[PDB]
């Protein structure tokens, strides 16, 4: 029985994004209330949450309506913009030298050890997002899992992922054998959701203009919360929090899907997540993770005084959101008539490939082409990732990188002005 | 003993989806009205008729003003709709010139001394100003000189008037005198808003399908409680006590001052007067500028990610924040072009104290805001929020020449979009 570790990701940054390092500050006192110990456990949140302007109870986090405070304890690791690929990489493998900025601290497992990564932001087909460009993209993330394999310096790992389209991070990437078992909160065409939201009835956060927290991620770690973790199992998790975010009825909802060595699965939840002393035996979903960013601007443009500065700002905010993702459909939809056709266009850019199939074959092709889009029609930020897909099916049509630029060259021609087009901070790719 | 015909005039000043709920409230409004004893050719309605057989209605051909309320679309007569709903009809009907009435059905208030009438609107409106689903818009005064000059026909003994719209209240604020035997009632007084109610953002009983608000506070107040009473039984005075406390802020919260002008002593008249009454016999959080948003956004929030309804949605949510960003920047420039840095806001945003008139000069108010559409489009139903500011510009002393000018070095060139369009003509 070796020691068992921890690696929390928030890939997101922002007041509207407040869920997402809510729900790494809860995982995180979830971890140590049950065992795990502040040395085992390694943080990545950008920090612009608990001091943020926009929170109305500074240097506090909750991660539910009636929550209390879970961002005080926390380990400062890895932040603002220290939160980045390869410090991530270098966590999980361990290596100290590879670190750039933070604490410093890394998985320096054993072979006995027990490892479980949790992740929760935005995201589309075949990447996830970060709050520094460029974005993890899924074939480096299983490289580095399979790199860490080699080095067996694991017993067994567990994967909970929160993000859109989550089950394409996996899916003809993650392999059997590893001793890894991956969940998502969707498969690789669905969709992720903030719960815990402004307007939403399904319990709303009172004077939030912000979600909360995230429905898959808040479903396994309430559960987990209230459970004793020696009884219930992995599988049993699974199950329950399918069940938890699956649809009613004819109703919008996600399949969590499981990836790798399910057998993994039958494994007590305390071999991960340890468990806490009080022992017991074993509601949204109407706002994605795209919209959810919206909804703060339009809560706090809708609760702002009539003729105040804060109606204007958050009027601009609305406004060059809404803005920058019309402008993003629009590229991406005219690249695609522009390079296959009228017909073909639609076409090449929506298939999707069967359930185990790998996204796009050349992934460095599809990091290229982001970057030739990019080059012309502006960033494509943590929203326009969701047309990712459209650009793997480019590169699995064979299309070259000079196609692409020329193609956005034609398409865009100026680079749009905006916040959220801006280049300043690196390629998306 | 009813001596002489009780009449009625319901009018929406709006059109657009958006704004289902003013037509709604008319609509109520009159089968209210017949269900009290009054009929149907006692009653002129106004109303743009683009809402029943409207491609957003999720039950075509109907219309309701409550969540789980009927339809009230049905048997309601179409005197004036479509670009009939103008100022020129209107006061042709109120005034009872068959011959000054141009298209519409005909129908006009022909009353008598003996005959009560009834008035009720519900729309948009700013300061000193009403709207129309035409151009140009309804000004206080000329509202004013119309009931003035209906009263010298002395071809009526009482008149009430209901009014639902934002800062209610300028519209009789200095202008509607006593001893016309005019009683009126506003949803607001000249300084703060109007709301819409039963909205899908609204928590308190939303609509069940519907992406838009059903009714209006002031207006589903007054009407679901005459529906309920007898009404020779409630008095005038009752109602407007009920309205006021329902419209009112819970606390610490906001609501809207109902507010009475006129003649007050008219309103310890009982409603069956004016409304008649219901044989069944028992005994006695979003403005409407933004309620045109909620639409637009509640419909792209509840539309398919992929589907064009939401990028089309998308752009409704666009056109209208950029626009009234134009507009009110527009306004603030003309102010300090006209006054400075400093005293423009002061000028332009100090607001008169109760019981005074909005501008001195009406005709300068029209033209100076039409000087202001030739260079910066049209205000639409949203702009004319700034009407005080074109007011104090006037109290001012500013000429109509210092405003053309102004407008054009504000407005250099003619914004595009759909509400900044002067293709239907100037808003004054």
Same mark, same amino acid.
């Given at each position: 029985?070796?020691?068992?570790?921890?690696?929390?990701?928030?890939?997101?940054?922002?007041?509207? %994004?407040?869920?997402?390092?809510?729900?790494?500050?809860?995982?995180?006192? *979830?971890?140590?209330?049950?065992?795990?110990?502040?040395?085992?456990?390694?943080?990545?949140?950008?920090?612009?949450?608990?001091?943020?302007?926009? !929170?109305?109870?500074?240097?506090? +986090?909750?991660?539910?309506?009636?929550?209390?405070?879970?961002?005080?304890?926390?380990?400062?690791?890895?932040?603002?913009?220290?939160?980045?690929?390869?410090?991530?990489?270098?966590?999980?493998?361990?290596?100290?030298?590879?670190?750039?900025?933070?604490?410093?601290?890394?998985?320096?497992?054993?072979?006995?050890?027990? +490892?479980?990564?949790? /992740? =929760?932001?935005?995201?589309?087909?075949?990447?996830?997002?970060?709050?520094?460009?460029?974005?993890?993209?899924? %074939?480096? *993330?299983?490289?580095?899992?399979?790199?860490?394999?080699?080095?067996?310096?694991?017993?067994?790992?567990?994967? #909970?992922?929160?993000?859109?389209?989550?089950?394409?991070?996996?899916?003809?990437?993650?392999?059997?054998?590893? !001793?890894? #078992?991956?969940?998502?909160?969707? !498969?690789?065409?669905?969709?992720?959701?903030?719960?815990?939201?402004?307007?939403?009835?399904? =319990?709303?956060?009172?004077?939030?203009?912000?979600?909360?927290?995230?429905?898959?991620?808040?479903?396994?770690?309430?559960?987990?919360?209230?459970?004793?973790?020696?009884?219930?199992?992995?599988?049993?998790?699974?199950?329950?929090?399918?069940?938890?975010?699956?649809?009613?009825?004819?109703?919008?909802? =996600?399949?969590?899907?499981?990836?790798?060595?399910?057998?993994?699965?039958?494994?007590?939840?305390?071999? #991960?997540?340890?468990?806490?002393?009080?022992?017991?035996?074993?509601?949204?979903?109407?706002?994605?993770?795209?919209?959810?960013?919206?909804?703060?601007?339009?809560?706090?443009?809708?609760?702002?005084?009539?003729?105040?500065?804060?109606?204007?700002?958050?009027?601009?905010?609305?406004?060059?959101?809404?803005?920058?993702?019309?402008?993003?459909?629009? =590229?991406?939809? *005219?690249?695609?008539?522009?390079?296959?056709?009228?017909?073909?266009?639609?076409?090449?850019?929506?298939?999707? $490939?069967?359930?185990?199939?790998?996204?796009?074959?050349?992934?460095?092709?599809?990091?290229?082409?982001?970057?030739?889009?990019?080059?012309?029609?502006?960033?494509?930020?943590? /929203?326009?990732?969701?047309? &990712?897909?459209?650009?793997? !099916?480019?590169?699995?049509?064979? +299309?070259? &990188?000079?196609?692409?630029?020329?193609?956005?060259?034609?398409?865009?021609?100026?680079?749009?002005?905006?916040?959220?087009?801006?280049?300043? $901070?690196?390629?998306?790719?």
């Amino acid at each position: 029985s070796g020691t068992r570790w921890a690696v929390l990701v928030a890939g997101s940054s922002g007041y509207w %994004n407040y869920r997402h390092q809510a729900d790494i500050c809860h995982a995180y006192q *979830l971890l140590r209330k049950g065992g795990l110990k502040e040395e085992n456990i390694v943080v990545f949140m950008y920090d612009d949450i608990a001091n943020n302007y926009e !929170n109305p109870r500074p240097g506090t +986090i909750i991660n539910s309506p009636h929550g209390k405070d879970v961002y005080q304890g926390v380990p400062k690791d890895y932040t603002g913009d220290d939160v980045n690929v390869d410090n991530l990489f270098a966590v999980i493998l361990g290596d100290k030298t590879a670190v750039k900025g933070g604490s410093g601290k890394v998985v320096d497992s054993g072979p006995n050890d027990h +490892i479980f990564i949790f /992740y =929760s932001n935005h995201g589309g087909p075949g990447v996830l997002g970060m709050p520094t460009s460029p974005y993890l993209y899924a %074939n480096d *993330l299983n490289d580095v899992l399979k790199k860490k394999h080699a080095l067996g310096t694991y017993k067994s790992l567990v994967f #909970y992922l929160e993000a859109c389209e989550s089950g394409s991070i996996f899916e003809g990437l993650l392999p059997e054998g590893l !001793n890894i #078992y991956a969940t998502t909160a969707s !498969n690789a065409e669905e969709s992720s959701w903030g719960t815990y939201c402004p307007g939403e009835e399904p =319990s709303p956060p009172p004077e939030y203009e912000t979600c909360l927290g995230d429905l898959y991620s808040v479903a396994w770690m309430e559960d987990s919360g209230m459970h004793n973790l020696q009884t219930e199992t992995l599988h049993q998790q699974y199950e329950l929090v399918k069940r938890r975010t699956a649809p009613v009825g004819y109703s919008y909802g =996600s399949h969590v899907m499981q990836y790798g060595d399910v057998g993994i699965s039958k494994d007590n939840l305390d071999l #991960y997540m340890g468990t806490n002393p009080a022992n017991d035996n074993f509601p949204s979903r109407v706002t994605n993770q795209r919209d959810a960013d919206l909804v703060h601007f339009w809560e706090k443009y809708r609760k702002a005084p009539e003729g105040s500065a804060r109606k204007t700002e958050a009027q601009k905010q609305v406004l060059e959101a809404m803005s920058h993702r019309l402008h993003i459909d629009n =590229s991406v939809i *005219l690249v695609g008539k522009i390079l296959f056709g009228i017909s073909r266009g639609p076409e090449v850019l929506n298939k999707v $490939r069967s359930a185990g199939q790998p996204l796009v074959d050349d992934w460095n092709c599809l990091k290229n082409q982001v970057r030739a889009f990019e080059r012309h029609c502006g960033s494509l930020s943590q /929203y326009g990732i969701k047309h &990712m897909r459209s650009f793997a !099916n480019i590169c699995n049509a064979g +299309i070259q &990188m000079e196609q692409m630029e020329e193609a956005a060259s034609q398409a865009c021609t100026t680079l749009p002005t905006g916040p959220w087009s801006s280049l300043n $901070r690196g390629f998306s790719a």
